[PDB]
Design a binder for these strands. Structure first.
Lengths: 103, 61, 73, 209, 143, 137, 158, 190
RNA sequence: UCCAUUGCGACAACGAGCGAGACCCCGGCCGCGGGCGCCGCGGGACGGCCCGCGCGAGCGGGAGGACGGCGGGGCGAUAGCAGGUCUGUGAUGCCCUCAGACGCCCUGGGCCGCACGCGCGCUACACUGGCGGGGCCAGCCGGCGCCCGCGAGGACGCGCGGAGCCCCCGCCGUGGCCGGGACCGCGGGCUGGAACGCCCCCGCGCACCAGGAAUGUCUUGUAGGCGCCCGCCCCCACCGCG
């Protein structure tokens, strides 16, 4: 029936997240729609001293972890409890790309 | 600070360790100094550069 | 060092300051302070009186500084 | 229009699992030395966990009738507190072991621990790499190689990159520590495969007739 | 304001509480020349006494001068609070007052005596002249 | 409207009108208070309360459908703390006086509440605008 | 507080929808982090900035700077038309310049006769070029040797 | 013309022509707008500052000391005040006065070290127009600054006085004095 | 010739490679798509055009253009130093300690003590200013109502949200003065098992008038001025990354 379901997917690298996007859009055109929302990029920042001892020129590392997030809440009533499964197993099983479903 | 539920569950016993206090430490090398609590990490700065690439932190810009 | 008053001791106001200023084409608070050796505030008050009377007029105004012109000639 | 205190759960539910992966890397590296361990990966399927391994000879880690693997699965679950039987594992096999730095350097460590001289071990490694189709391999062995006054003597064969972004794609590096009676013997390896995968090294132009 | 000319009773220099005060300054900043009186306490005192505050102290007629005295010895009656006073919860009588010149010097002397016979840390330090608060010595503060 | 006239003349004219028309009155604690920890001495004018009142009502009108809390207003009356041989820092204003002002306004129905905060009521818009037009000439 | 790139600004949902459809032209200005959006239509010569006329912008001294193109081109065109600007981003002066840029560009788009548009371009650019072409320079990053982009920490040799 | 850019909406810029030919082409007067404010990135080429309107060149020099860096609106106001004062005293257009000052101020000769020999061995030389105008402006500003410090009088009156005296060729001013000093230490070394 | 062993043109040398560049991130202009929230994929600039030169590589000027000639960052060759780190680690060789312990746990004190020499910073020496009132705009990003209390803070209850300089009006009027805010004397609170720690109120009101011999940093959104966030953190930023 109708359960206002929403799809959220998260990843650290921008190449699979866009590939997963395309597969899902391809596989959800019928079970209603599935247009994406691209969120602001959460970037984690850590600055560290490059030295373990504190000697010489004060030189710094600059790491970061960009996390990309997309959100298809377009299923909505257009997907039933089992219908969500159909596509979610027909989409590729990329090794790393967290996914959670909620009404 | 119980970094994980595993590491605890709530004569000398009268005063073995009665001075309860935060004991936050690196979850790799166990040191109590220079511990990044930001983002719920709990990794020392030294014990960090090594494993950062595995975790996913990278150096650009 | 130098000291100047803040209040005019009676006849002093008119026996000079009023006379002196009226024979000036342009004027400002600070000039008159340095000219007859009185503080600036008294200058403010006096010039208020005078623009009320009509001898002087404003050409430029601002909190930091205003300057007058002698409309009596 | 949106609250930032809620999505922090999605963001913090990714970070934890990235960390959980690294502990496994360390543990396997300290454990599956004899199985040609290389790397790991994870898939946080809600019902159960899946882990994919890269090993030269999995049958060693597979264990007769899958005993070692199963002994492992029940173990990890207690530590990460998951219901066992939802902590399954899979193993994948590396076919180009010469292109993998980890296999090479571990083999070198073995050979060194058997007292063989460095001059033979390094060049055997390097021959093995070139046979695999590689454009260069460099080996280094620093430490108290002689009586005292430790020095580093390095062996190489082909051409290698050393700078630029391309070094994060075509250059594969690894290191180890070897504990011996005299002291510690540092060893590190690096291999260069320019025609790896499908990516094309820049500043490389091919013309037509 | 609008006082250009000295009033017939202008008093070129005022004496009060053994201190002397000039009549070219505005009133509330001249009283600051007394020891025990500042900006905040003065504006409050005068206002209660129905005195203009943007006035040159030389036009201060003695009628307004006396009522001011009457408010600096019994200020609490005149509506002023108790968090605005110099001396709150005296060590002996437990009351609250405001202490002006002469009183301050005597009062300050007796506390140190109290501190001395009692044998505290502060008293011993005061007598070799060191920092009383925890502000660090050693670094800086040298000739 | 009100925004078609400079803010400077409106504020003071309306304050005089308010003080004449008994809408609000300065309580007793005004005789010895600052308007913020950031300040240093007390105000020099005797009619600063009504200036604050007018600025506030103007703020409430500008926002409109939106709702303003007391502290949010107090962040519009902040300043800078000086005299500490330490780098200066910004500090928030007071809230007791603001609270008294809004309560006095609300007791007259010029100001109405809601789920959170308060907002202007149609009568407030009526009077504010009519006064503004009157002073437009 | 405002961010410039927000969708709530570029579309100007502030205006009500039945009135949002009478505005034919659209326009952009910018300078530093400041951005201005203009919705030009047909009227009898009225301009507004954040629901405030042009005569009562706040720095006071620059009112001429925003009125420039009118006294350049002439008031005929502007008298013909009516405008409603909205700006959001860093700084009073940045906002001023963005606003004037938007004015000029929008009035340029109102005319359909390209020849006149080019003639007006020549007439206007000669006096100044930043009235049409956005200024590119923007705030630059700092480094860890000191407390500035190019300045360094003072060094003591002995 | 159609739009006479009367400066500050008071005094025109149509009858203001420099007399000295040497530095004429290094003083812009036809382009000034109504405000001495223009965010233009001058000082990018080697001779583009030769077009900057002279009044803007002057204002940019009044916010020099670190206490007063980045404050241009104050300077615009200051200049307006001075111009009112000038028109009041002299009776004529201040802009002419300003160009006349910038002309009469500015050295025509200077000394530099080129003769080596282990000593000053300075040689007298000539001076380019651009440097002349730059130095004239700098000296005007500096002389006004030195007077108004720890003095009751304001910055603007000092400015106006310096301008008027320099334009009159009088040596009471600071600018003329510096000019003369440099000329003599030079001619001594010629 | 080139910022560059960057290239041209020759030569008992011929032919290759690393480094440099290329490469990756950010920004500026345009297009397509999508869109809770502005974010994904591409185009565009190349010493290309004109004029001068130069065999040549390449130099100077003018255009048109969002941008014009290495725009800001990351990576970082061979060889090496008796440079720093055994007090970052289930990294470690050889020594020393190992049941009145240098192991581990508890209570207190100390790392901060002060006649003295010097290193990075902060605050000021005033009118191009200080005080009081009002108006108003940011970005890394971001939480608020009501009621008490002068304030700092506090009791309840819900998910909602941005500043200094600057501008306008007034007071002060060259006085170590309303500049400056160290030191000290009563009092009210917060963190915590615990104040020696940090905030607020009244009074007192130190040196200081632009700094000798000597010396550091800097070319466009740069210096300088102005403030705002994170890190470590029970409380606390004159520090550090931005």
């Amino acid at each position: 029936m109708h359960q206002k379901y929403t799809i959220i997917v998260v990843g650290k690298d921008l190449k699979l997240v866009e590939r997963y996007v395309k597969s899902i859009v391809k596989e959800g055109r019928a079970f209603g729609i599935s247009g994406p929302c691209r969120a602001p990029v959460r970037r984690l920042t850590i600055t560290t001293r490059k030295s373990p001892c504190g000697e010489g020129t004060n030189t710094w590392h600059r790491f970061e972890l960009r996390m990309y997030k997309r959100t298809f809440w377009v299923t909505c009533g257009g997907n039933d409890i089992s219908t969500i499964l159909s596509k979610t197993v027909v989409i590729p099983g990329i090794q790393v790309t967290v996914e959670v479903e909620e009404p | 600070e119980a970094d994980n539920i595993n590491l605890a569950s709530g004569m000398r016993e009268t005063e073995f360790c009665t001075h309860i206090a935060h004991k936050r430490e690196c979850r790799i090398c166990g040191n109590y100094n220079s511990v990044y609590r930001k983002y719920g990490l709990f990794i020392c700065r030294r014990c960090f550069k090594e494993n950062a690439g595995k975790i996913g932190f990278v150096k650009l810009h | 060092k130098v000291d100047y008053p803040t209040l005019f001791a009676d006849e002093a106001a008119m026996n000079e300051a009023l006379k002196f200023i009226k024979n000036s084409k342009c004027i400002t608070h600070t000039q008159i302070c340095e000219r007859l050796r009185v503080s600036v505030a008294l200058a403010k008050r006096v010039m208020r009186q005078l623009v009320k009377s009509g001898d002087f007029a404003i050409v430029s105004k601002s909190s930091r500084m205003t300057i007058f012109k002698n409309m009596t000639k | 229009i949106v609250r930032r205190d809620e999505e922090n759960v999605y963001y913090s539910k990714y970070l934890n699992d990235c960390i959980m992966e690294a502990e496994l890397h360390e543990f396997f590296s300290r454990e599956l030395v004899d199985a040609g361990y290389a790397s790991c990966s994870l898939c946080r399927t809600i019902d159960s966990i899946c882990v994919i391994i890269q090993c030269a000879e999995p049958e060693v880690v597979m264990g007769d009738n899958h005993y070692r693997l199963h002994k492992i699965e029940y173990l990890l679950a207690g530590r990460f507190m998951c219901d066992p039987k939802n902590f399954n594992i899979w193993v994948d096999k590396i076919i180009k072991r010469g292109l993998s730095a980890e296999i090479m350097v571990d083999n070198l460590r073995a050979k060194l621990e058997e007292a063989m001289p460095i001059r033979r071990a390094a060049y055997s490694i390097i021959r093995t790499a070139m046979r695999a189709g590689a454009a260069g391999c460099e080996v280094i062995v620093a430490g108290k190689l002689r009586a005292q006054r430790a020095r580093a003597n390095k062996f190489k064969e082909g051409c290698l990159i050393s700078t630029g972004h391309p070094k994060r794609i075509f250059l594969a590096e690894a290191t180890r520590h070897i504990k011996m009676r005299q002291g510690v013997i540092g060893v590190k390896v690096r291999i260069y495969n320019p025609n790896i995968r499908g990516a094309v090294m820049p500043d490389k132009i091919e013309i037509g007739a | 304001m609008t006082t250009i000319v000295q009033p017939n009773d202008y008093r070129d220099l005022l004496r009060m509480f053994n201190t002397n005060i000039q009549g070219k300054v505005v009133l509330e900043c001249a009283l600051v020349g007394i020891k025990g009186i500042g900006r905040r306490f003065a504006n409050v005192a005068l206002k209660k006494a129905n005195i203009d505050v943007h006035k040159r102290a030389g036009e201060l007629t003695a009628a307004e001068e006396d009522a001011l005295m009457k408010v600096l010895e019994d200020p609490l009656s005149h509506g002023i609070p108790a968090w605005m006073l110099n001396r709150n919860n005296d060590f002996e009588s437990g009351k609250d007052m405001h202490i002006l010149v002469n009183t301050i010097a005597s009062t300050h002397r007796a506390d140190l005596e109290r501190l001395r016979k009692t044998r505290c840390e502060r008293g011993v330090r005061h007598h070799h002249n060191l920092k009383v608060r925890g502000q660090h010595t050693k670094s800086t503060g040298r000739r | 409207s009100v925004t078609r006239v400079p803010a400077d003349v409106f504020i003071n004219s309306f304050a005089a009108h308010l003080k004449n028309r008994g809408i609000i009155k300065c309580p007793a604690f005004t005789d010895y208070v600052k308007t913020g920890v950031s300040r240093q001495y007390a105000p020099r004018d005797a009619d600063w309360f009504y200036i604050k009142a007018a600025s506030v009502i103007r703020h409430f009108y500008i926002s409109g459908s939106h709702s303003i809390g007391v502290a949010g207003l107090a962040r519009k009356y902040s300043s800078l703390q000086k005299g500490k041989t330490t780098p200066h820092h910004t500090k928030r204003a007071s809230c007791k006086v603001i609270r008294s002002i809004v309560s006095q306004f609300l007791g007259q129905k010029l100001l109405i509440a809601g789920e959170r905060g308060r907002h202007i009521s149609p009568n407030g818009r009526k009077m504010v605008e009519d006064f503004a037009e009157g002073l437009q000439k | 507080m405002a961010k410039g790139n927000r969708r709530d600004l570029l579309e100007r949902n502030d205006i009500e929808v039945r009135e949002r459809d009478k505005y034919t032209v659209h326009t952009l200005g910018k300078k530093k982090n400041s951005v201005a959006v203009a919705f030009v239509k047909a009227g009898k010569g009225d301009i507004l900035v954040n629901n405030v006329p042009l005569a009562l912008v706040r720095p006071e001294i620059l009112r001429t700077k925003v009125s420039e193109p009118i006294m350049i081109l002439g008031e005929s065109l502007f008298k013909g038309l009516d405008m409603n600007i909205k700006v959001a981003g860093g700084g009073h002066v940045s906002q001023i310049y963005a606003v004037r840029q938007a004015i000029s560009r929008g009035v340029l788009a109102s005319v359909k006769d390209e020849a006149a548009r080019s003639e007006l371009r020549a007439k206007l650019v000669s006096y100044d070029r930043q009235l049409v072409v956005s200024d590119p320079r923007r705030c630059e990053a700092k480094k860890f040797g000191g407390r500035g982009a190019r300045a360094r920490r003072q060094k003591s040799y002995r | 013309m159609s739009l006479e850019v009367a400066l500050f909406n008071k005094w025109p810029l149509t009858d203001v022509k420099c007399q000295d030919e040497s530095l004429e082409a290094y003083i812009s007067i036809d382009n000034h707008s109504f405000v001495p404010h223009s965010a233009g990135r001058w000082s990018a080429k080697r001779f583009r500052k030769a077009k900057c309107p002279v009044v803007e060149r002057l204002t940019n020099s009044l916010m020099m000391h670190g206490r007063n860096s980045g404050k241009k609106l104050m300077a615009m106001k200051t200049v307006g005040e001075a111009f009112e004062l000038i028109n009041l005293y002299t009776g004529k257009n201040p802009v002419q006065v300003l160009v006349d000052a910038v002309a009469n101020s500015g050295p025509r000769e200077d000394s530099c070290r080129i003769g080596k020999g282990g000593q000053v061995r300075r040689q007298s030389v000539d001076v380019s127009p651009l440097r002349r105008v730059n130095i004239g402006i700098y000296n005007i500003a500096t002389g006004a600054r030195k007077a108004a410090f720890r003095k009751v009088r304001p910055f603007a009156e000092c400015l106006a006085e310096e301008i008027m005296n320099a334009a009159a060729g009088a040596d009471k001013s600071y600018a003329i004095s510096q000019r003369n000093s440099v000329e003599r230490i030079a001619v001594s070394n010629r």
